[model samples]
Target chain A: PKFKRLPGHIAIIPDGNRRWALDRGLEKHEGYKHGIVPGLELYDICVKIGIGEVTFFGFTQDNTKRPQIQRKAFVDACIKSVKELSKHDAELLVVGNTNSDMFPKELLAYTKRTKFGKGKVRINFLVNYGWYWDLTYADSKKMIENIASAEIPRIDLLIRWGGRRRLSGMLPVQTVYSDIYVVDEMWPDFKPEHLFNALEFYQDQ
Target chain B: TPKFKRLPGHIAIIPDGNRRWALDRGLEKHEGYKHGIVPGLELYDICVKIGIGEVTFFGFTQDNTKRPQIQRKAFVDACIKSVKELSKHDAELLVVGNTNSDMFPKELLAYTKRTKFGKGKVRINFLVNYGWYWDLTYAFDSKKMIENIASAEIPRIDLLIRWGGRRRLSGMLPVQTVYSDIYVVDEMWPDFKPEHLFNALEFYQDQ
Candidate 1:
């Protein structure tokens, strides 16, 4: 097998479901289904390339609170993908503080299973979300004011995809200290080549 | 008035107006500028007393780069003179970035150093350079991002700020803005005597 130079960690924002559905004249559920599979495929690529861990922004807790027609469609599809991941070489875990009732209990068991393995190119799904991710400067100083004064840390890099030409302001203020990379592609259409393009652009920068 | 405790930590002052104010007043622009400085300094003193964190006097933003060479040079020299005068005060002076983007001449750096080194109690930061927005905009466009958006998984701003404050007017903000006409006095900075400064602050003040 040919080796690729590996990065320490990879984080992916799986964007674009509505656009995919609209373009195809398909139901929103179909587009979401299209979305999850490509991520799994990317996981396969990461595994093949000898990369260690992958962090994916899979679903939000708010999505769990969504109405049944849309909610159940995504849950059913996501659980099936997790189950199929068992047959593949890499382990599967779903991160996010999603509501328990939104998904099957068996799938929940599958998520916990991946935690036990050592040196097992662990896939850490950031379960649930944080009130404030440390990197953002939004209210961070106020947040930090009460804490013991110490060294202020530097952020390394920030990557955003598939939003407007102008940025959404709600990001971590810490990211301003780092280099930023933005891409125009949607999630399902994104393949290894598209990711490679983003990487190459980063290298050039 | 219902009060909100937090505010933007750093405030940038665009010390505009002396030339225009003088032109409007039928006096030498320089004389009008001289009249403006004393009060501006007094406001700085008050802010220091009030525990304000940082003050950035926009001695220049990138827009200043477009001014005529003579005007620019005059402004720069005037700033040097002002800094020297201000150095006599007890404030810790910092010559922050945004002006003189490249090399700071030995004399200016020395002056800046002297201004920075002298103070005992009060802290002040100054920026005398241009922050190239084009360069900044692109640099941000080329980096790898982790988390930026308010996602479904994350605690959103709507939940956090719902307890207080008016909404932003930007259409892109998920929560609709509580748009209102909060009158801002368009006083030119150089003409803004202590009374004018206090009046502007009072108009905006909730209490």
Candidate 2:
């Protein structure tokens, strides 16, 4: 590693699937499936690079408001990716609102950390997640560390794909000092260099 | 075609690199802060000319007071001088931070209540000993973030500009910055240029 430092935790925001599909002359929802394999490929990279943990920006509660077809498309993608990753060597935990029916009931088993195979790397999948929901769930009496997010540590770097500069309301308290890197390429067309580029950026810091 | 139409209603400034700028120039570390004072006024002038309603300056954090006593004194004086200078240049000034801490400069305490100074055309928020946690817990005594204590008074930040090349947020208001468009500048604080703000505004407009 040509680096002096490494990000212990990385938060990923894979955006612009719909736009990628539109540019490709396909239906918007159909583009979501293309995001699945790239994500798994990213998993392989994370394991290879020995990232301590990684968090994926899965479909949020606001996403459920999309058209029925697109809504179902993303939800299915999250579930499929979770199952596929679980089949690999990894420790997985899903964060989001279980009370809402919008959350995939199929992935409920993975809500609490479940170690699969012999993976040492931690992975968090946020589905139907909302900033307000997370804060509201947090115990007000205690500070950020003791909140509902006690399990998840603060993020060191937040890499957003698809060229968006704004945080679509990721873990609020956790990302306070997060160094952000934005990649212009959309999620479906992800390149390994994108992750490397971000890692290199972090290492340089 | 018109290249611009909208503007960021509010922008947050993270003026960094005063210490680095000094070392790079072979000057003492604390000496750099005093040099940063003039650019603060220039930025204030540019902001009002551009018609920005609200702006916040993220000075030093409470954690920042842990540095050498000399460096701490330097920044504390710099913030006090900067805010006082902006007050005379048409800004609604609010100096927020943890007043309970001794690190909080006593001189700037009177501005905590959001007083209009000069023309008071622009809203200026100066964060001296501020921390995201302190604001969250301001009224956090908080079932809800909106209703209680601290930074609730401040509006959402549309554009967040950081000078001095660092890519971190350094724990600025987490809630308000949720959807902010962040711009980072390599030029250190003392070396600030009007073009930096102009470039940031243009970039923000394109976004």
Candidate 3:
């Protein structure tokens, strides 16, 4: 629970739903449902510890361009999960391609940086986001604040669950200096120790 | 010789801790750059032997310029020297960076276009004054897809290995390194060994 330093801002890349389900001998799509609870639990810990900022990879452009049953599961989980976070003392801002139909309509209100409870923490959810889209959305003449992901602060540490080491293009500009750490466990199997270990890793670095 | 389950098609190397290596040896921090150059060539030879087709090295970043004037000039001189020496080998070489900036060395201008040196057995990309934001905004075409934000010359990375114990990418091609399996080596660039590559490839197979 104690460390020399902690990441002021952290981003979450929750990956490996299909593999998690395959490991449990359950339907591949079923793993997405189980991930929702873990998402909420992470949010609670972030708030309790007074993390400055947290961004969740809600869905990527390709994630929404998939098969129907699988597509709805991720979108529904994203919407349901954000709505749950809204009950806490957090400021939620969702960034994504709103022009595309793939963007969830239910989460439109959050696109404008909606405040819930005391708004103690800043949260960003990338719904229909992609690295290219974020780059194109930026005003070339202006500085970083004009970028597509202006709401999300510079990431100090980025932790990806489900054991993948790649960034998968999460906030390219913001994460320029981010120390990316991967947790071998699936999102459904997230433990507080995963976060604790990441904080510890950041300290030693 | 180590037998492997599989080999990575593309490799990204981040050579860090040159300054620290020098400081540890009671030499000026900037003195470490020259020591790392030989290891870079040594590692290239090992890569060719292991059949790695593509390799990219992180030479320096724009943020790295924040060091003292002596240190800044030391790294700039080091990168220029390393690239010229690398051209002596058999590889398809490209020196990528913010060419528009004054910090980008003019000495390697001739090698910026992927020139083939020697027999060109392997493809090598040496990033000089590269920055993530700079690469992203370079000739960005609004009419094109997201992947087109950066230059088309670079390919996606399969495995990324960083020496000197850092765990971050320091913004090495955002989209290109999206799915890369990262491996960190605690030793400095001057201490690079074939064992590092062997260990990383072994780690990659598990991923």
Candidate 4:
């Protein structure tokens, strides 16, 4: 069959932790654990597949205010993941507020350490839940308005993990004219086949 | 005994492919649309019989408004006719639309309003015009707006939906990222039979 290349930038919203747990007869944390691992696998696959940039919603801005015990566990796991992957070539950028002092000390330290070096593929993790104020069409228009502003460029494609029911809204600043690929697999269950299906749609579109 | 442990509180539909369905049969698209209205009314009738609550036929989008004028007139005719038929069935009628410009006919508007205003039970809320942008613009901040237009956004939907599950707001845009895993029916509204609805509902229940 005729096909298209992998996307330059892909995004995912990791949904269905509780549902994953319920289906597996596991706790919600276990579901998150399973899901988070696969999420990393997706990034690795992206790198292998030659995607230039990818962003996973690792932790939302809303997650910071979750119960302390749960928050600590999540941050610890993230910090550990970052620490393990720190030496890799991917440029790790957090897209939400880092100065909020919301994360645990160890996690904060680990994140800072992860950035000790940079990599080839840029990986951005957006953290805010209601990140609307952070972007707008006018913001993109303003890019060419003055010396400080820079022109926004076109986006080739946007791949959304299909598990989400609804379409995610976008800001105009960093992009225009990109295509969307919404797939159907759950985040934790998203496998190579799922990835191929998404790619297939992207190519077809 | 009740079979469904939990069902979708609100079901929204796109009601797509009517024109194509008609044109494929070598018939006028309006005729397809005309045929389409009955099955939907039948579905509405069955739902009312089974005591199924409100169904939001996210009936028309702004994109549909850009369709041919002939079909637009057909749609308006269909709604008016549907409302008249609704009075005969166990349905309450509310023909809702969000239009920046008043493109709808005055007669259809008055009829839908009066029908809805007159009835109290078995309600039908028809969205004559709508767009998903209504929610995105209302809920998302300027930053989301920019990222969307520029195509560089990573919506933190998982975090939002995960934080608040099972208790979603009825009218507002979602605060988090969530979607129906198997909520949609494959059958179009025109071809949607009760058995098909039952099958879809049963599948969701099994989940």
Candidate 5:
């Protein structure tokens, strides 16, 4: 490794899928279809590089508000990916507000899975996640603690693909100190070189 | 004419790489603090000219107390001088930080007086020894945290500009940055230019 320092945890916001599909004169759902494989491939590269953990922003609390067809496409694609991912020899953990109506019921079974194949790579998926202030907590500490209990590791580097600079409300506490890397390439077209570029950028920092 | 179609109500800055800038030049880290003070003033002047309503500078963090004694003293000393100079700049001065923190500069306790002076065209906030936990808890008293948040407000940041090529917020106010558009400049703090500020504003306008 040319870079002596390594990030313990890497988080990604795989954005611009719909745009990628639109650019190719395909339906919006094709973007989600193309987005799935790169996500898994990124994990393979992470494992090879010896990263401790990875988190992917698969779906958002706001994404449910997208057009019904688009929402269905995302949900269907996510369910299929979750099943495919379960077969891999890795510790898979899903973090999200499962209680929310927007959450896909299909993946709820995976969240309940206790058994996992032995693999060094730790993978996390964030679906239907958002910062929701619970009014029940009269104390601010209690409120913050409730949110922190979700147990996502503090991200060392957060890469947002598709060139958008905004966070768009990913894991807030985990990203507090994360070095953000924004790539202009859309999610479907994301390559191993993009991940390498981000890693190199992080090491130089 | 400014490139921004709509101006940010408030902009927060994380002025980083000062120490590196000094070390690169074979100068003491304290020298970087001294050099960094002037650019902060220049930024405030630029903000005023460009019609930015408010500006917040991340002066020192509570975690910075872990640094060497010489470095900590240098930062505290530089911050006190910076605030004194900015107080006279015809802007409402507000110094926010955990007053309860042992490292918090007591000298800044006097600047908490938010009295209206005739020179109130702009608001300048200096976050000294600030931490996210302290702001949320407000000295371990949760009740006061909620109350103080309502009465003592830090405006939601519109545009967050970080100079130093780093992408991290590094303990800048959390709640304020929730929706802010971030602009990262590769230049170190001391080398920051007025054109960089203009470029950031232009980038933000497109957002």
Candidate 6:
């Protein structure tokens, strides 16, 4: 409860869902299905804490390498999750190289959608996001601006639920100065307490 | 004997929480900085003993100018003093930062004096008022910006350690840290010990 200064932008790497399902002897697809709700719930919590922007690493371009069936499950879950979150007051911005075939066609509609009703928080979903720093731009200034323009807000804090230490190719530009918190709890098991504890830890910094 | 079979080729550090450390003790923020400088020397010695190739210290950022004038002055003074002291350790020095930025301390210009040490075993880099964007522009004379950014001799960070529990890079060099393994130490810079370095190094060995 001692959380006073909140981060302007927060990013989450909801990891370990498939591992969570495997540990319980359930199908791998079930883990992704179960993971969707927690991602949605965090927006409400962020709204309460006065966080202005949030980015979720929904599906990486690298993640498309998984089995066909498993990859399909992730795509479906991501689509469903975004549609559910769109009903909230928050504005949604989906970032990624949708030009790549790795992106799911179902999610392109949401990327173009701009609908919000007085929500203070902005949600960014990095679906099929890749850290390809293109250099063929006009000049150095333009190249740097391109990278900066493609990103969401500069992340104030980056939280990874599932005990991973790596950034796993998330938003490199936004994370340049983000305070990172790695929680041992898996994505499906993430709680408000974990979020509060992270905020508390950040306050000390 | 150490537990690791190999040492990191390059290590980058963000020594943070000095202000918070001083405030918690009911002392001036400047007091925390005084304690923070000594640990850096010790870490350098550890790197030498462990045979690490290079070490880069995040001394200041362009954004740090936002602090009050007095605090900014104190940080600049502390950085100058620290650099002068560390220069004598038989290591090649490179002070990389946005020197073009007016906020960069002019005092650091004198410390840019490099010496031809016999068998320069370890390289020391001080990033004062550094920003990744500036490096991109400077590299634009010939090659692609991203290629130049990645290939600049800052060295790919093998391990990045940030003391003070915060999880952000705080605009430290982006290309160097692109694939580096990160370790966050909860203790403030004033309380950081050689053991913490070992712990981080050990963790890196595991990876």
lDDT of each candidate versus the true structure: 0.45, 0.86, 0.85, 0.51, 0.78, 0.78
Model 2 lDDT, residue B99, Cα:
90
DockQ score of the complex predicted as candidate 3: 0.55
TM-score of chain B of each: 0.58, 0.94, 0.95, 0.67, 0.91, 0.90
Cα lDDT tens digits, model 3, A92-122, are 9999999999999998999889889999888
Clashes of 6: 6
Off by over 4 Å in 1: A1-5, A98-104, A110-120, A127-161, A164-181, B1-207
The DockQ of each candidate is 0.02, 0.62, 0.55, 0.22, 0.45, 0.41
State the lDDT at B35 in candidate 5.
Answer: 81
Docking class of 4: incorrect
lDDT of 1 by residue, B81-134 (tens): 666666777766765333244423233565344254355355555445534222
lDDT per residue for candidate 6 within A1-205, as digits (tens), equals 5576888888899988888989989988778888888987888888877888888988777789999888888888888888888788878888766778887787787665366777567888888876652222225556566652254667888899878676776776678878788888889998989899878867776
User: Poorest 10 consecutive residues of model 2 chain B by lDDT?
Assistant: B140-149
How does residue A20 of candidate 4 score in lDDT? 68
Stronger candidate by lDDT (3 vs 6): 3
How well does model 3 score by local distance difference test? 0.85
Please provide TM-scores, in order, for all candidate models, with all chains considered together.
0.42, 0.96, 0.93, 0.65, 0.91, 0.84
lDDT of 4 by residue, B28-116 (tens): 88766676678667767666656555554544555566878888878767766766676676565665545444765465465345254
Tens-digit lDDT track for model 4 on A12-83? 666666566668787656656666676667767776777776655566556767776566656665665555
Q: Which stretches of candidate 2 lie over 4 Å from their true place?
A: A1-3, A139-143, B1-3, B141-143
Candidate no. 4 TM-score: 0.65
Model 1 Cα lDDT, one tens digit per residue, A19-59? 66777798766666776678678767767666566555455
Give residue B126's lDDT in candidate 1 (0 to 100).
49
What local lDDT does model 2 show for residue B69? 99
Ranking by lDDT: 2, 3, 5, 6, 4, 1
Model 5: fraction of native contacts: 0.50
**Highest TM-score model number:** 2
Per-residue error for A72 in candidate 1, Å, reads 1.6
* Pairs of residues clashing in candidate 2: B138-B149, B139-B149
lDDT (Cα, 0-100) at A91 in candidate 6: 81
